[PDB]
A paper describes a structure:
The E. coli AcrAB-TolC drug efflux pump contains the inner membrane H+/drug antiporter AcrB comprising three functionally interdependent protomers, cycling consecutively through the loose (L), tight (T) and open (O) state during cooperative catalysis. AcrB is the homotrimeric IM proton-motive force-driven H+/drug antiporter component which recognizes and actively transports multiple drugs (antibiotics, detergents, dyes, and solvents) via the tightly connected AcrA and TolC channels across the OM, leading to an observable resistance phenotype. Four different entry channels (CH1–CH4) have been described with putative entrances from the periplasm or the outer leaflet of the IM toward the two drug-binding pockets, the access pocket (AP) and deep binding pocket (DBP) inside the AcrB pump. Here, we present 13 X-ray structures of AcrB in intermediate states of the transport cycle.
In an attempt to prevent ansamycin binding, we made the switch loop more rigid by Gly619 and/or Gly621 to Pro substitutions. Surprisingly, the crystal structure of these variants showed propensity to bind either 3-FOR to both L protomer AP and the smaller AP in the T protomer in the same AcrB trimer or two rifabutin (RFB) molecules to the AP of the T protomer. We assume that the Gly619Pro and Gly621Pro substitutions induce a switch loop conformation mimicking a transition state during wild-type L to T conformer conversion while the HMW drug is bound to the AP. During the L to T transition, the HMW drug accommodates in the AP/DBP region, mediated by the flexible switch loop of the T protomer, in an induced fit manner. The intermediate positions of the ansamycins observed in these structures appears to precede the binding to the DBP as has been shown for erythromycin in the MtrD homolog RND pump from Neisseria gonorrhoeae. During the T to O transition, these drugs are then exported via the DBP area through the O protomer exit tunnel.
Numbering used by the authors:
A (entry chain B): 1 to 1034
B (entry chain D): 11 to 166
C (entry chain A): 98 to 241
D (entry chain C): 50 to 145
E (entry chain A): 290 to 337
F (entry chain C): 866 to 913
């Protein structure tokens, strides 16, 4: 094939042009995002039971839905929460590769059939089924500076005048309202209701009657009387549209003639649906819009389109309303692309310099400058065909592949330049002979590198999803590089390169280039003399090899494991957790103090603080809160002292002084949709109907035993909430029946007043909105207020609530967890320093077996992921090693010789481990893929040395040591050229401290350190490996 | 609401005997309470921790302390079927005829959940068997309504 | 034919009929299933000690085993060879007539006195200024 | 049933349309609300789109809107199915 | 009585059921035991 | 109709470029492609 395209350079140019156009077309059309779909398909069923406790929600909603989640395909596990906010979340996680649309519709459909089994109040509110596995592109904050609007007022404007227009914007997947539109709030008064002998039942009955749609008919409707001229629709009572109209709702008519209206026994205003959340942006009231990116959408275009559409709404905003951008990932992805494009261009520039430094002609330096972009462009076209997006994983996949792409260009051109120098052949004839020497090896290398990288794609779960992004990217880039090296580069060499005279190595020149040639020629003679000395006493280096292999194995165990490096994304979180039973106001004071700190102490770093009171991802009680801190630009925060990690540690140490509030600052993870993915996620299950109390006792027993092993387990917390005091009230049936008070009227009066009650809909400026009836705050705060509520009996007398009820204090769950249908309690934790996750998980299983009878366990989240992903690893390592051996065996026509190549692996790995250990980095995925590229390029160098050494012994009939010395002499220059270019190429990634520095550091450090050892050791050790293996097996 | 007092409440609730012992030595407030008005003795009696009830009483804990609705630790001990704690409280001068806000005595609560042994102990220490709640119902009226033959025979 | 789409199309039309059906039929739970008519296997359950009756074993299978098998991927339908337990109110017409009552009064009483009420919270949002107490109100619960 | 075009547009059509966002291969969305009470929201997708997957994605997004609709609308039942504007044929029936 | 879902594999589903039943067995009351009086999968497994 | 008209120029552009490169590949020349592809206007005017 090389000989074909040397005689046909135009056909080679045509293939180059087609790849460039296909690549250029792909760059325009390819989707753009921060990360691809890594987390498994998850479907969260969300419902709301206003004024309901955790057990009421569980025993009427959660258990009923759970029981009807059958005949759904590819379901791994089901986990649900039921808490005293009156909320349920049932998350069904599915197998990796499952269609999320088919997954959602099957869950949706089984829920629809179970809707008649739920209570009317839950059916009225309704149940939502959404994909929860996806994450936000940006969070658009909406505030009021002039202090004319509350958070309820802002939320209504965003719902009415913004949300819909943002949803219709190009590339916008989903829009969640951070708050709710207005609700007609009837704030009932028990003193006024008792005065006119009325109840919340009378208020609900009146609102349902006097605010409703009424079907009428038509004038002259079919079938008509013959001779009818006019046909018109009859409009009857439509829904009410103002607080004034709701005020005039007639409740009672007295004997004297006075009219008892709804405004006479309640305050009426437009308010929020729920008052649990108090969102503030630097003290001011705030709402927002959580925007998610659509499938196959461009993140850069979508963000620009969102900002463009928000600009069009500027003139129509009320006075003091402003748009803010606390969370936006697009700036990060903008830098991610710019830094990767810089690395690829700098890499090509460094090849141009190194090619000119050694070969010393411009015609030679142009050949890699053409060939490398052709391969990189082609890679985008293959990624487009596989349906991949331009993301952080695929972008760093290109950067790690540069070493392999650059080598293909240098190896082919340098070998042609050498053949012309030594034999004195013209360019065309020299290229035919040069390609003849390497064409077999290049095909062999392709199959070896395939066997290394392809098995990485077939890992299972979230880990395997990330490994798949690097695998397909590197294999595609490497594959095209070999095709370009056999099709295009040979044609370019034959046409562009000039002839060189026999025995001309640029020693006759003067200046810098004259000095360099004479210096390098003597340096090559020093190298050959050194290898000659090494090959006389091989035994001593086999001992030094074992020291490196033992040193490698030692550093592997010592170096701690992680998932991804935490990045400075210009945002971090500060959780606020008060003691159990603490009110909303107490939590607000701590958040106000936390907001005050960041605007005072960190005024140079912090841009804003989004104080979300009564919010939390593991339940939303009044005592818990959270503050999303947004920072200034990366240029405005110079040095390590002004980064997120530094601000986190200073903030956490500052807030530890505060009493009656557990307050910690913490950085976001790399993939925010997935989480930390480091420790373990344990589930303790009630397997024999023991109950809540006995499962609590079993949990406390496990936590107590976990504390007795600091050496293995650490940071072992339950994800759930502790039991809290709750106001148990027992309605006496006999006393209620005796006085003539119905249980419906009692339970409605209590539920509607204290809990709230969604009555019906009303139309506010051409938008359907809810009508809630509830007690005014002051009449539903303390147990004493129970007696102030009166219910009318059958005989007409008003009976106080105290007359037919008794109350006491008891303990109950404010958040009940369930796993796979049965009651559960989720327990977190991580392996102690030195110990692996495997050991920590193994001890938790041992401690779990000594818990009481009918108490089981299971692993969930990343623990479930890693256990199935872990079993696959040995097989994929085995397949990789076996096929690499088989491929090399076919290349060399020998069972023994392959071992000479495969013994290079530790030489590259040891340097990566030293660099990671020295700089103090972790064994993350960027490092692990970094090893394969270092092993791949080091293995590639060894293959060409052994091929040259073997071909000299077979064809030219030279001796073992003669061939080995002549081989490494010929291969010294190209190995140093590639290494010099690639080490300088990844040097900026090591020293980088800006945005996306964590990933760059992980990619750079491992490769640089690995390439230094891989280059320096292998040039001496590959000689030893070949001679020892050749001596041993004839 | 002292620092050690809040730790004694959580310790007494969980049942950490070793931690309670240390807090009694450091001088933790035995008469400290949460928002509902529950002392460590209330919590220890509720969750059925015999040792901590004994330790708290020795360190001058109020046996007849009541919450915001008038319930004493003897109510909680009698209601949730803790025979040992009921005896220990009554030995340390627990009011056997203690009425809450609803007029519910420990005898009413013990009768309702059918704790036969606790009813005998309460009657021994001088429980008023004819004591009525706010609805005018005795411990006998609870036994006949629940349909407890054994309990009805004892309350003769 | 794709059985996934077949199920979606069939149930899309069933949802138009569902509200027109009697209320007793809706509350029994209508089910759309995509499975073979014949049985893959029968998982029989017995008691060697003879401690549990036919009814006790069926209840345990229905309460502790059936659901997890029904959720397992590939399981299109699960038929219980028995019945899950339920609170059976076996009415007496002689005793009902004596106290001048009907099944209607029994059903009304059960709905009233076997109820799970949403009673709200003490110190619920929005609260008054200077609120310290925040606790769930627990009224009537399901009888056990 | 009974509601005029304006009431039906506000309480039903806008509630569904606002939730029909970021569906795969959606070219445009036409709809009309009439005096009898009927709504018809037609979502036309790109050529080569799987109509069965398109139907599923529309159905998934509708059931978010369904709870925000009135009870009378939920009682009639909201159908989501593949559609075409023109007739293949008209089969007429007469009596001789 | 377990019926195989349309298109699903007999042996894989049967293996999944036995795996889920194995999780329940430890938490049974005394005396209770699983028996296999009808299974079509063993024939398919043994005959191949 | 709007979509058909908007994508017509690019359809002609790529169609011409593919035929040019295919002639360049087959006949191993730049002159022969440029010699051949100059004929296109002679045909197109006849169709118009
Ligand atoms: C000091 O130890 C605690 C820190 C608290 O401080 C906070 C402010 O920092 C946190 C950090 C940095 C986190 O990553 C998480 C949480 C917190 C805190 O709360 C969580 N907070 C909760 C929600 C609130 N309740 C608390 C309640 C009982 C008062 C439960 C925990 N869930 C939490 C998580 N996600 C989950 O539940 C699950 C399913 C995810 C994955 C689990 C792994 C195994 C963990 O993520 C692991 C890598 C580690 O992070 C924890 C072991 C962490 O210990 C560290 C930092 O090593 C403790 C949580 C977290 O990922
Ligand atoms: C900024 O928001 C993220 C914070 C990250 O930073 C971390 C480091 O700080 C956390 C803090 C302070 C937490 O309190 C939690 C977690 C994290 C983080 O990871 C969790 N981490 C997980 C545990 C791992 N799973 C995936 C698993 C299959 C591998 C999901 C994440 N859930 C987590 C929790 N525990 C739970 O209760 C579980 C088990 C369910 C929670 C349900 C939520 C309501 C939904 O899942 C979903 C709608 C969304 O709310 C999350 C996905 C959210 O993401 C977004 C985009 O909003 C993250 C919490 C937490 O309480
Ligand atoms: C899951 C992970 C992935 C799995 C991967 C599985 C891999 C399957 C096993 C294949 C291993 C191949 C690796 C070794 C290739 C060495 C080729 C060199 C052969 C050789 O010595 O011939 C010389 C050079 O040949 C040349 O270089 C060119 C001429 C030879 C062409 C034919 C070679 C075979 C084609 C390569 C692909 C084979 C695998 C396809 C599935 C002389 O040349 P000559 O005198 O022979 O030239 C005239 C042709 N008649
Ligand atoms: C919708 C989006 C569209 C985007 C735009 C995409 C454009 C499509 C691609 C266009 C490609 C056009 C390339 C034309 C090259 C012109 C070459 C000039 C020389 C020439 O034509 O004269 C020949 C001399 O060539 C020789 O003999 C010298 C050959 C060696 C030099 C080869 C250099 C090739 C340059 C490649 C350019 C790369 C462009 C990248 C896009 C005549 O002699 P003859 O060869 O005909 O006859 C052999 C004798 N018997
Ligand atoms: C991080 C790991 C630590 C770094 C390890 C670096 C290993 C690679 C360095 C190889 C250096 C080779 O350097 C070479 O060594 C050999 C010894 O074997 C010397 O050889 C000398 O001793 C041998 C003894 O058998 C004689 O046969 C030979 O005549 C004599 O010259 C060479 O004169 C010297 O040039
Ligand atoms: C020339 C022979 C080289 C063969 C090496 C093949 C190993 C990789 C196997 C594979 O597919 O797994 C990729 C895996 C995914 O996390 O990446 C890795 O974890 C990198 C492999 C670690 C270094 C191995 C050598 C040290 C032995 C003690
Ligand atoms: C604004 C940049 C768009 C192109 C992204 C891909 C570049 C490698
Ligand atoms: C080194 C892995 C392959 C082992 C099989 C070949 C033995 C000569
Ligand atoms: C697979 C290796 C066998 C070689 C025996 C000579
Ligand atoms: C519009 C076609 C022109 C072609 C000339 C090469």
């Amino acid at each position: 094939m090389p000989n074909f395209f040397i005689d046909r350079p135009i056909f080679a140019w045509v293939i180059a042009i087609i790849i460039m156009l296909a690549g250029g077309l792909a760059i325009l059309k390819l989707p753009v995002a921060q990360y691809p779909t890594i987390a498994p398909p998850a479907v969260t069923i969300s419902a709301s039971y206003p004024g309901a406790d955790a057990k009421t929600v569980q025993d009427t909603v959660t258990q009923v839905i759970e029981q009807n989640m059958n005949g759904i395909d590819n379901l791994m596990y089901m986990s649900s929460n039921s808490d005293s906010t009156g909320t349920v979340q049932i998350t069904l996680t599915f197998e990796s590769g499952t269609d999320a649309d088919i997954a959602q519709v099957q869950v949706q459909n089984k829920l629809q059939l179970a809707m008649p089994l739920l209570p009317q109040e839950v059916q009225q509110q309704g149940v939502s089924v959404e994909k929860s596995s996806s994450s936000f592109l940006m969070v658009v904050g909406v505030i009021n500076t002039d202090g004319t609007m509350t958070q309820e007022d802002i939320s209504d404007y965003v719902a009415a005048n913004m949300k819909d227009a943002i949803s219709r914007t190009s590339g916008v997947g989903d829009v969640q309202l951070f708050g709710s539109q207005y609700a007609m709030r009837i704030w009932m008064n028990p003193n006024e209701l008792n005065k006119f002998q009325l109840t919340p039942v009378d208020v609900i009955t009146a609102i349902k009657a006097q605010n409703a749609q009424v079907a009428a008919g038509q004038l002259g409707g079919t079938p008509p009387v013959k001779g009818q001229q006019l046909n018109a629709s009859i409009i009857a009572q439509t829904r009410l549209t103002s607080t004034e109209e709701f005020g005039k709702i007639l409740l009672k008519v007295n004997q004297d003639g006075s009219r008892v209206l709804l405004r006479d026994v309640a305050k009426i205003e437009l308010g929020g649906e729920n008052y649990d959340i108090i969102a503030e942006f630097n003290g001011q009231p705030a709402s927002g819009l959580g925007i998610k990116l659509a499938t196959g959408a461009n993140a850069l275009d979508t963000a620009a389109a969102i900002r463009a559409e928000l600009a069009k709404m500027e003139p129509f905003f009320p006075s003091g309303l402003k748009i803010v951008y606390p969370y936006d990932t697009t700036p990060f992805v903008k830098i991610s692309i710019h830094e990767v494009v810089k690395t690829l261009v700098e890499a090509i520039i460094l090849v141009f310099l190194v090619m000119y430094l050694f070969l010393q002609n411009f015609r030679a330096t142009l050949i890699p400058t053409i060939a490398v972009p052709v391969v990189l462009l082609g890679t985008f076209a293959v990624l487009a065909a596989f349906g991949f997006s331009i993301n952080t994983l695929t972008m760093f996949g290109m950067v790690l592949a540069i070493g392999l792409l650059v080598d293909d260009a240098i190896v082919v051109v340098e070998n042609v330049e050498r053949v012309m120098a030594e034999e004195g052949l013209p360019p065309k004839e020299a290229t035919r002979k040069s390609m003849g020497q390497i064409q077999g090896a290049l095909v062999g290398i392709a199959m070896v590198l395939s066997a290394v990288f392809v098995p990485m794609a077939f890992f299972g779960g979230s880990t395997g999803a990330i490994y798949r992004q690097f695998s397909i990217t590197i294999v595609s880039a490497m594959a095209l590089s070999v095709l370009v090296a056999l099709i295009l580069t040979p044609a370019l060499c034959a046409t562009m390169l000039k002839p060189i005279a026999k025995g001309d190595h640029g020693e006759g020149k003067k200046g810098f280039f004259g000095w360099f040639n004479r210096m390098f020629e003597k340096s090559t003679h020093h190298y050959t003399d050194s290898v000659g000395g090494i090959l006389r006493s091989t035994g001593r280096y086999l001992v030094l090899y074992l020291i490196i292999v033992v040193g490698m194995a030692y550093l592997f165990v010592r170096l701690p494991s992680s998932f991804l490096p935490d990045e400075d994304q210009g945002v971090f979180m500060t959780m606020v957790q008060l003691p159990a039973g603490a009110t909303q106001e107490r939590t607000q004071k701590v958040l106000n103090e936390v907001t005050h700190y960041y605007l005072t102490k960190e005024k140079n770093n912090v841009e804003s603080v989004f104080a979300v009171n009564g919010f939390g991802f593991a339940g939303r009680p009044q005592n818990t809160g959270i503050a999303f801190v947004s920072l200034k630009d990366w240029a405005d925060r110079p040095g390590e002292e002004n980064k997120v990690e530094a601000i986190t540690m200073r903030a956490t140490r500052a807030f530890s002084q505060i009493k009656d509030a557990m307050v910690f600052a913490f950085n976001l993870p790399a993939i925010v949709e997935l989480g930390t993915a480091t420790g373990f996620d344990f589930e303790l299950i009630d397997q024999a109907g023991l109950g809540h109390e006995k499962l609590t006792q079993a949990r406390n027993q496990l936590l107590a035993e976990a504390a007795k092993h600091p050496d293995m387990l650490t940071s072992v917390r339950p994800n759930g909430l502790e039991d809290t005091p709750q106001f148990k009230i027992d309605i006496d049936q006999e006393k209620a029946q005796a006085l003539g008070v119905s249980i419906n009227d009692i339970n409605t009066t209590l539920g509607a007043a204290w809990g709230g009650s969604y009555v019906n809909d009303f139309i506010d400026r051409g938008r359907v909105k809810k009508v809630y009836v509830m007690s005014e705050a002051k009449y539903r705060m303390l147990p004493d207020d129970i007696g102030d509520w009166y219910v009318r009996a059958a005989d007409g007398q008003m009976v106080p609530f105290s007359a037919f009820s008794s109350s006491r204090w008891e303990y109950g769950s404010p958040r009940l967890e369930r796993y796979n249908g049965l009651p559960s309690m989720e327990i977190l934790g991580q392996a102690a320093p030195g110990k692996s996750t495997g050991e920590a998980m193994e001890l938790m299983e041992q401690l779990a077996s000594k818990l009481p009878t009918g108490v089981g366990y299971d692993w969930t989240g990343m623990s479930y992921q890693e256990r199935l992903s872990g079993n696959q690893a040995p097989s994929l390592y085995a397949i990789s090693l076996i096929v690499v051996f088989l491929c090399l065996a076919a290349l060399y026509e020998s069972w023994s010789i392959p071992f000479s190549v495969m013994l290079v692996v530790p030489l590259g790995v040891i340097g990566a481990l030293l660099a990671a250990t020295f700089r103090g980095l972790t064994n993350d995925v960027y490092f692990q893929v970094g090893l394969l590229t270092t092993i791949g390029l080091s293995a590639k160098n060894a293959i060409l040395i052994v091929e040259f050494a073997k071909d000299l012994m077979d064809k030219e009939g030279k001796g073992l040591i003669e061939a080995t010395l002549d081989a490494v002499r010929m291969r010294l220059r190209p190995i140093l050229m590639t290494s010099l270019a690639f080490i300088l190429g990844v040097m900026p990634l090591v020293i980088s401290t800006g945005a996306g520095s964590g990933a760059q550091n992980a990619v750079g450090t491992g490769v640089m350190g690995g390439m230094v050892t891989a280059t320096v050791l292998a040039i001496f050790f590959v000689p030893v490996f070949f001679v020892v293996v050749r001596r041993r097996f004839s | 609401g002292s620092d050690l007092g809040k730790k004694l409440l959580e310790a007494a609730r969980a049942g950490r005997d070793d931690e309670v012992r240390i807090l009694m030595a450091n001088g933790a407030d035995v008469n400290a309470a949460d928002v509902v008005g529950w002392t460590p003795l209330h919590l220890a009696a509720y969750w059925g921790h015999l040792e901590i009830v004994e330790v708290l009483l020795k360190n001058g804990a109020d046996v007849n302390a009541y919450d915001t609705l008038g319930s004493t630790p003897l109510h909680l001990a009698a209601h949730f079927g803790h025979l040992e704690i009921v005896e220990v409280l009554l030995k340390n001068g627990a009011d056997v005829n203690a009425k809450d806000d609803n007029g519910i005595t420990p005898l009413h609560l013990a009768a309702n959940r059918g704790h036969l042994e606790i009813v005998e102990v309460l009657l021994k220490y001088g429980a008023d068997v004819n004591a009525q709640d706010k609805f005018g119902k005795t411990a006998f009226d609870i036994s006949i309504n629940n349909g407890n033959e054994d309990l009805a025979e004892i309350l003769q």
